[PDB]
Amino acid sequence: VVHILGKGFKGKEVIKIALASKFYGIGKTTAEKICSKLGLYPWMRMHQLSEPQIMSIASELSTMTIEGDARAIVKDNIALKRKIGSYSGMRHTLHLPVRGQHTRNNAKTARKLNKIDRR
Amino acid sequence: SNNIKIKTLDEFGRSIAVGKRKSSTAKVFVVRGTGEILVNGRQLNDYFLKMKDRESIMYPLQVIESVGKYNIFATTSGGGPTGQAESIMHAIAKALVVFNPLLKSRLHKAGVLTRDYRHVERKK
Amino acid sequence: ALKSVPIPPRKNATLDHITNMIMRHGKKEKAQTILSRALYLVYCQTRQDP
Amino acid sequence: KRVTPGSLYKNWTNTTHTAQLQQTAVPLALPIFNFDDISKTLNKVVSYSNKQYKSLHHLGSFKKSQFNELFQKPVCLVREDATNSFLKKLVSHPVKKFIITGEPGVGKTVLLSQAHAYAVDSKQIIINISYPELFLNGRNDFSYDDDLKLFIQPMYLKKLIRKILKANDPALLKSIELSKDYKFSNANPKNASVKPFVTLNKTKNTVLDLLSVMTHPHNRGKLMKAIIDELSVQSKVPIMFTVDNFSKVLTTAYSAYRNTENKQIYSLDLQMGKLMMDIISGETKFANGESSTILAISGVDRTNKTLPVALGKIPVDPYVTRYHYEPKFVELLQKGNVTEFEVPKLNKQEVNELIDYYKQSNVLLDKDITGKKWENLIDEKYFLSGNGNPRELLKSLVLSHR
RNA sequence: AAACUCCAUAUAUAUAAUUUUAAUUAUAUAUAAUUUUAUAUUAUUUAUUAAUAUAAAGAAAGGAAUUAAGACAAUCAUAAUGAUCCUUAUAAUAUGGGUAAUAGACGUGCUAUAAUAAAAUGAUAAUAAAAUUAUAUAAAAUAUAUUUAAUUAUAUUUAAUUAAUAAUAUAAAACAUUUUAAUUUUUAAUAUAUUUUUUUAUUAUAUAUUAAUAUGAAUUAUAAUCUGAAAUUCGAUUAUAUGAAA
Ligand SMILES: Nc1ncnc2c1ncn2[C@@H]1O[C@H](COP(=O)(O)OP(=O)(O)OP(=O)(O)O)[C@@H](O)[C@H]1O
Ligand SMILES: [K+]
Ligand SMILES: [K+]
Ligand SMILES: [K+]
Ligand SMILES: [K+]
Ligand SMILES: [K+]
Ligand SMILES: [K+]
Ligand SMILES: [K+]
Ligand SMILES: [K+]
Ligand SMILES: [Mg+2]
Ligand SMILES: [Mg+2]
Ligand SMILES: [Mg+2]
Ligand SMILES: [Mg+2]
Ligand SMILES: [Mg+2]
Ligand SMILES: [Mg+2]
Ligand SMILES: [Mg+2]
Ligand SMILES: [Mg+2]
């Protein structure tokens, strides 16, 4: 098991895929740039990394907006909608779809995740 | 009077027949040779990737046991690989009768001289 | 010479039946490939006609 | 575990390649491949010699998907229009730079294996790059070397150097005394902590010693440049440099590797690419006049205007996008005076010889032996194979159960 | 009713100065089958017979429309006639809103829940048919996303064609190569090999785990674009991020 910034990774996992899977705010394109910047070859796996290289990943990850910081940006944008009294803000408060979806049927996911304190 | 004129080889010894299957059509040139086949100017293995399509083309020649006695220049258009391969099969059988009209009965019995009528039917 | 030769068989009835049972969605070529590859592995271990 | 020690767990293509299914094959006694006595083996199926098999297995001459598991050992038909024609040009032509072409499955790899067999017999040192995709797919480590100004690939280089050592006769390698002194960092786990470096003095150590140097991954690029330089300066032993699936190199100008700016790395910025194209272009000249460079394309790779233009088969179209036309590769190929040898398709008599060998190997189905006349079988299999394609011939015989 | 008739299919003639090219075609006319014959067997109303098989000839194998009654259903937002009611309003126009609300329930679809199956790549370009383009179809090129290029999206520009001519539009699957979590069935370091794109040996390669991954793409944040006078309720597309249920 390789631990980067608390996240645990299985040795066989490909670094560029693992980074975009466990870290909030990092996708496929962002993960590839991090690996390219650190000199990791495209299909290198976690078990190959050395401790100096594990620290380099944590350094580059700590200079980005990820995890709590990224999640806070979404929670604060949603809160602003409620503060100004916009139609979208009310939908977030009522746990209803906010993008024009019909509610006579379906709308189950919006009733499950839409909230001012969105995860 | 009748509307049928005896079919004969052309000035270059070639028997020309047309065949149709589904939406595909094939015009083949059969001449006495050594078993060389060309489909739209391309090698048989190149144009037809499926071995079952290749075996369909060879079947009429296998019935008269003349697989190595003729050169075939097949030109095909329309439909897909199966329609074209079987349209070529039908056209070779119709072109082989000129070389020996005594083998028509064997070709008919094998089923290679019958035009397959099945086509995509608009649901009714 | 041909009068006494049986018309060669267009296809093997058993193999054609097995192929169609494997086949789904009209993908006969894949079904034929699977059967041929399986029968190729039978020959390479038994060295008899699969 | 679900997988037992002998369970067949891989896919079909890897199982046939790796499952050792030739063990049950019947031993047949065939003549041996010898170009010096080709008159006795022309148009006949031959096995390779024991010295040739050992070298060709270490070079990667035999590949998967060649139905090699049907026979005890890989066999080849000595052909007049392909094998004899190519080997005579290789012995006579002064330039000795060839690229083998032909339709997919025509037998381009087998021809290259027969050229490797000739080289082994004729006391030559063979450097083979069987699968160039391994250094272009981005699945092994890469590092930038400041002294070479190239991206070196240590993991790949370690495998390549061992292949050059295990596939070639030690006596030939020992004959080439070193021309310069070399110093490398010591990675031998026995004395690495005692001796910081390993020195190779000139006129005392040989190229055999150079191929056995255990160095650190960061100094392995400088070891590959020394090996090539030593083999290109000596005039004692001819060097046969071969690259199979060269079409991959021509059509993949940019590797999967990315630099620190997330920019894909040009293939000529890799040492393997630079080294390969230096030998082909003529930049790296070999002192011995019997040294050759045989390239072979593969039908598994995409095609574009690069190779046809380099060979003079089509005019240069300047408005073709770089993804379909690489003008730099064309310049390198034309600077090296590389000539094309198109592998012809099999004739009906050659098909007869191959099908007669297959009958003796017991690989033919009972529907092609019982109740079928021999002449009918040859004509049918010559028609179903596209009039000569060796791969379509084998498939029609052993992989067509319909 | 059936016959007949038309369509399809096979064939013949005619037409095309074979660059509007697909002549392997187009569409006018005609012909063909509701097939025919011999033979053996089994039945029969046993004869000039059906069911069968055998042999021979044949391209011949599929559809369409079709009478009048009787009994019954629908407002037809798919046409009427009368009666009946409104006539400063139950008629007419404008602005905005609604028809898109959301507890539960039901119908019909779409995409999924991985290895007989998904994802990439395939340029002298594998292989279609039927349609559309004067209230238009929009090529190639260039620019940006964006990276050598390709790919995808939009912008710039508006070539050709109002068409068997040019455009929408290089069909797709197929096939080949590569890759693929669960899976220590992997990967890596050494050594090893006559499996070398690979074998074997020794070490490390995590645990968690009936479970949701490199499956899945719902939901959501931000930025940009398209149509339109206008995209807030309430449209479409793209990028980065998010990654639910199953
Ligand atoms: N001379 C020969 N003798 C025996 N078998 C041969 C010969 N030439 C080709 N074959 C067989 O034909 C098949 C294809 O051969 P090979 O792999 O050399 O072809 P290729 O053209 O290099 O293929 P690709 O285009 O995929 O690279 C194999 O089964 C091989 O054994
Ligand atoms: K992520
Ligand atoms: K709504
Ligand atoms: K519903
Ligand atoms: K024409
Ligand atoms: K509305
Ligand atoms: K799948
Ligand atoms: K098309
Ligand atoms: K809107
Ligand atoms: Mg090859
Ligand atoms: Mg409604
Ligand atoms: Mg095409
Ligand atoms: Mg364009
Ligand atoms: Mg295509
Ligand atoms: Mg595809
Ligand atoms: Mg669940
Ligand atoms: Mg996905």
Which residues make beta-bridge pairs with D339? D98
Adjacent-strand bridge partners of B42: B39
What distance, in Å, lies between the first and last C-alpha atoms of chain A?
27
Q: What region does C33 belong to: left with phi over 0, alpha with psi -120 to 50, or beta?
A: alpha
CB contact under 8 A, D262 and A41: no
Question: Is D330 in contact with D280 (CB distance < 8 Å)?
Answer: no
D108 CB near ligand 1 (under 6 Å):
yes
Please report, as a single letter, which amino acid is at residue A5.
Answer: L
Strand partners, C38: none
- DSSP code, position D177: B
Q: Count of alpha carbons within 13 Å of D195, Cβ hemisphere only?
A: 14
Q: Does B62 touch chain C (CB under 8 A)?
A: yes
Q: Is the CB of D396 under 6 A from ligand 1?
A: no
Element (H, E) at D391: helix D390-398
Interhelix angle D85-92/D108-121, nearest 10 degrees = 50
DSSP E strand boundaries for B24-110: 24-32, 37-39, 42-43, 70-77
C-alpha D167/C-alpha D354 separation (Å) is 29
Task: For ligand 1, say whether the CB of D107 is within 6 Å of any of its atoms.
Answer: yes
Kindly compute the dihedral angle of the four CA atoms of residues D53, D57, D59, D65, in this order, to the nearest 10 degrees: 120
Contacting residues of D for A15, CB less than 8 Å apart:
none
The H-or-E segment that residue D279 falls in is helix D271-281
CA-nearest residue for atom 21, ligand 1, is: D105
The pairing of strands D264-266 and D254-258 is antiparallel
Cβ contact (<8 Å) for B46 and D386? yes
Please answer whether residues D308 and D257 qualify as being in contact, where contact means their C-beta atoms are separated by less than 8 angstroms: no
CB within 8 Å of D341: residues ≥ 6 apart: D85, D86, D89, D98, D99, D100, D101
Q: Which of C5, C10, C29 is opposite residue B50, by nearest beta carbon?
A: C29
Method in brief: cryo-EM
Residue D278, H or E segment: helix D271-281
**What is the helix, strand, coil percentage profile of chain B, to 5?**
35, 25, 40
Query: What residues of C are in contact with residue B109 (Cβ under 8 Å)?
Result: 7
Please give, rounded to a whole number of angstroms, the shortest distance from the CA of D139 to a CA of chain A.
5
- Burial class of residue D349 (count of CB atoms within 10 Å of its CB; 0-12, 13-18, 19+): exposed
CA distance A86 to A94: 13
- Resolution of the determined structure in angstroms stands at 2.6
- Amino acid (1-letter code) at residue B74: A
For residues B67 and D380, is the Cβ–Cβ distance under 8 A? yes
- D295 close to D100: Cβ distance less than 8 angstroms: yes
Structure tokens at D366: 């009972």
- Nearest nucleotide (CA of B21 to C1'): E9
Contact assessment for residue D389 and residue D105, using Cβ atoms and an 8 Å cutoff: yes
When CB atoms are compared, the residue of D376, D378, D392 closest to B45 is D392
Helix (H, G, I), strand (E, B) or coil at D401: coil
Interface present between C and A (3 or more CB pairs within 8 Å): no
Alpha-carbon distance of D65 to D398, in angstroms, equals 13
What separation in angstroms does the CA of A6 have from each of A45, D64, D122, D230, D298? 18, 44, 62, 51, 48
Considering only CA atoms, give the Rg of chain B. Answer: 14
Q: Residue D390 in contact with residue D354, Cβ under 8 Å?
A: yes
Secondary structure, 3-state, D43-83: CCEEECCHHHHHHHHHHCCCCCCCCHHHCCCCEEECCHHHH
Task: Say if ligand 1 is within 6 A of residue D120 CB.
Answer: no
Tell me how many degrees the CA angle D210-D278-D104 measures, rounded to the nearest 5.
Answer: 105
Among the listed residues D6, D21, D258, the one whose alpha carbon sits nearest the alpha carbon of residue D144:
D258
Measure the CA–CA gap between D145 and A12, rounded to whole angstroms: 28
**Would you state the structure tokens that stand for residue B32, as one six-digit string?**
């006495």
**D57, two tokens:** 């297995």
Burial of A115 (0-12, 13-18, 19+ CB in 10 A): middle
Distance of CA A119 to the CA centre of its chain: 10
